Design a protein around this ligand. Structure first.
Ligand code: B12
Ligand code: B12
Ligand code: B12
Ligand SMILES: Nc1ncnc2c1ncn2[C@@H]1O[C@H](COP(=O)(O)OP(=O)(O)OP(=O)(O)O)[C@@H](O)[C@H]1O
Ligand SMILES: Nc1ncnc2c1ncn2[C@@H]1O[C@H](COP(=O)(O)OP(=O)(O)OP(=O)(O)O)[C@@H](O)[C@H]1O
Ligand SMILES: Nc1ncnc2c1ncn2[C@@H]1O[C@H](COP(=O)(O)OP(=O)(O)OP(=O)(O)O)[C@@H](O)[C@H]1O
Ligand SMILES: [K+]
Ligand SMILES: [K+]
Ligand SMILES: [K+]
Ligand SMILES: [Mg+2]
Ligand SMILES: [Mg+2]
Ligand SMILES: [Mg+2]
Lengths: 188, 188, 188
């Protein structure tokens, strides 16, 4: 079992189906960024402590979902042999219930917060912004190729999830959020 | 209060003013990368310990400044309703005094250093390179649209600040820097 | 000694040789991403503990090699004054022996694993995906300019190294890997 095949040494790689693409192709970038997010989520999960244990399981669940998302991003819409498997409905509602819960429990802001606080909250804000980077790449792909739009819906919602969870993480250790000092009242 | 509006589910988003852009638009990428840097800085700040407490306040200050920078990056130069608020002068001189101080105190190198050392120093080198990534995106934007050039000045200087602070962080725990073994004498 | 020259304040910068490029130029991005990887590796190394000490030296070695790689990426192929110095052969075989060893020792999977586990294993998966991001940028450069193809070979192999090392890191603390629940048997 050798994970190195050396077939990518010239800069091309296989997607799902028969097509090979350059490694910088917008599709390869899209699921590559999802993979980087997925690794970051694993890193974030590794920072869980006794105050923040309640977040551990859902972070693992998100990793499972990001594999499902990446699968579809790797799959051309006109590949006869492979189909999209990701359905946004249940995963996205699941995220929304957590955003709702976490928004309700934490102290309310009007103003932008500094992305920071505890190590876990800060890692969740990093997750938030990597998710947003991945989303930009998914949009890049979408503008050139037919994608499963369900992935974009979920990935969009997911960065709201990470924002909400980051604030929740601070709340779980009673670390106050800090406000952006020049912020207008932006959350309504 | 629902932070999820679902208006971005199709890949477009509002900037400051009335314009909507695709999420992968160079402007949205520019302030998105600034936001990722901002989250990283929060993460770096969360790693401060009793040896490195002297760096905590300025890292928070940098977060405030990155919100000011992102505001202007989000604002088209011909938006009648919104103006640039960021002025580079004082923030950049403030960075320069710290670069000066930190450069003076730490052991002098000629040669490239390995970006590493303590956890905080290493996080500061990560900050350095995320700042540089954000700067590249700001330049991408600048080549297509009129930006507040003050933001570029500050963001340029900021990666020098993170280099200097990373070396300072090592010095604060008396962790020696390691040299790149094939380095020419590059700092003069 | 002032590391800030202010010459890049307008968005252009020098490469090796006489050429100046915009900071978002594909070459500047390529070695800039290598620099971000290099900083991440330093961060990963800073997470080493008594269980994982055996990985510390090779991570430092990888930092040395990434400087060698970046040098060549910074060097145009037709620069009369500067030459490529990186040779892939020995560094890449060195990576392969470690991939082999680490693959052999850890429990075998068929299926995709969640990128996660201990803090160090998770950081190694982050390294894996930053390496892959850098590789995409190196390919972007290659499609426009003649590069030292040895760098691409090594950088390709390196993300396999980080995958193998991440699994090894889990094994060193006896943290089980978790499988992607919808994975097909992909490793053969
Ligand atoms: C898509 C894909 C991925 C995606 C998976 C999720 C996604 N879609 O975003 C991502 C980018 C995460 C991935 C990661 C890696 N994968 Co991959 N992946 C593939 C690919 C193209 C499809 C996998 C799949 O779902 N197969 C199942 C069905 C859909 O395919 P089928 O042809 O109908 O059967 C395959 C090639 C293949 N198997 O076709 C490799 C492939 C399985 N993966 C490979 C490798 C090496 C990796 C990585 C180790 C690369 C790395 N160094 O990071 C990691 C491991 C990740 C992990 N956590 O376990 C190799 C396996 C080599 C071997 N000896 O089996 C393959 C075979 C590609 C190759 N030939 O080089 N990859
Ligand atoms: C620019 C901007 C940002 C920037 C701010 C700094 C910068 N410029 O780089 C960044 C990218 C950091 C940002 C982040 C987020 N923001 Co925003 N932001 C905006 C935007 C477009 C302008 C905000 C502003 O300064 N308003 C003040 C003045 C200039 O605007 P005005 O019209 O004259 O009044 C607005 C939309 C708006 N308010 O116009 C949202 C908006 C306020 N933000 C929104 C959200 C959800 C977010 C995030 C939670 C997104 C996320 N999941 O990461 C985060 C929160 C960040 C934090 N730390 O608190 C939502 C708020 C939803 C609500 N119920 O109020 C808005 C309304 C956009 C939207 N309709 O979806 N965003
Ligand atoms: C390429 C390069 C880098 C690469 C090096 C590896 C690579 N190639 O990927 C990277 C991107 C890592 C780098 C990083 C930085 N470097 Co640089 N680098 C250069 C450059 C263009 C070549 C260096 C070199 O190898 N010289 C040796 C030979 C090949 O050049 P020669 O002309 O024949 O002599 C020079 C400019 C120069 N020296 O020509 C700067 C230069 C040496 N570096 C500079 C700086 C400031 C930096 C950083 C501090 C920037 C930052 N804030 O992150 C960091 C320090 C990194 C560290 N760990 O020590 C400045 C030094 C200023 C001074 N007072 O000496 C220079 C002179 C560029 C400039 N004029 O602004 N850079
Ligand atoms: N740099 C990269 N960024 C994102 N995705 C990649 C990258 N390289 C390959 N891929 C995708 O992820 C899968 C696994 O990567 P892998 O390294 O095995 O591919 P490869 O580089 O083509 O092969 P090899 O590394 O054996 O030469 C590939 O089949 C491809 O779909
Ligand atoms: N992926 C992204 N990367 C960077 N910036 C973004 C991204 N998506 C939106 N933005 C910018 O940041 C602000 C807040 O993001 P937000 O998620 O609220 O926007 P949206 O995705 O358009 O809306 P929603 O998530 O409610 O559907 C936006 O108004 C826009 O200026
Ligand atoms: N944002 C960036 N991303 C990646 N590489 C960069 C970036 N800016 C400069 N470089 C490269 O790295 C080297 C060091 O960066 P440095 O900040 O010293 O350059 P500069 O911005 O042109 O100068 P200064 O910061 O003094 O105005 C440069 O010579 C150039 O090769
Ligand atoms: K491989
Ligand atoms: K939102
Ligand atoms: K500089
Ligand atoms: Mg959104
Ligand atoms: Mg500079
Ligand atoms: Mg490969």
């Amino acid at each position: 079992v050798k994970i190195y095949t050396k077939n990518g040494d010239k800069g091309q790689t296989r997607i799902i189906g028969k097509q090979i693409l350059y490694k910088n192709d917008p599709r390869v970038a899209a699921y590559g960024e999802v993979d980087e997010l997925n690794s970051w989520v694993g890193y974030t999960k590794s920072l869980i402590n006794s105050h923040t244990q309640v977040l551990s399981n859902e972070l693992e669940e998100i990793q499972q979902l990001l594999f499902d998302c990446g699968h579809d991003l790797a799959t051309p819409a006109d590949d006869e042999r492979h189909s999209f498997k990701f359905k946004q409905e249940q995963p996205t509602v699941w995220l929304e219930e957590k955003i709702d819960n976490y928004t309700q429990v934490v102290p309310a802001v009007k103003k932008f917060i500094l992305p920071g606080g505890t190590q876990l909250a800060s890692a969740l804000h990093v997750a938030r912004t990597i998710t947003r980077r991945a989303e930009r790449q998914i949009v890049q792909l979408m503008r050139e190729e037919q994608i499963n739009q369900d992935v974009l819906i979920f990935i969009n919602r997911l960065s709201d999830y990470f924002f909400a969870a980051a604030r929740y993480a601070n709340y779980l250790e009673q670390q106050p959020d800090m406000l952006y000092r020049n912020s207008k009242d932006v959350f309504r």
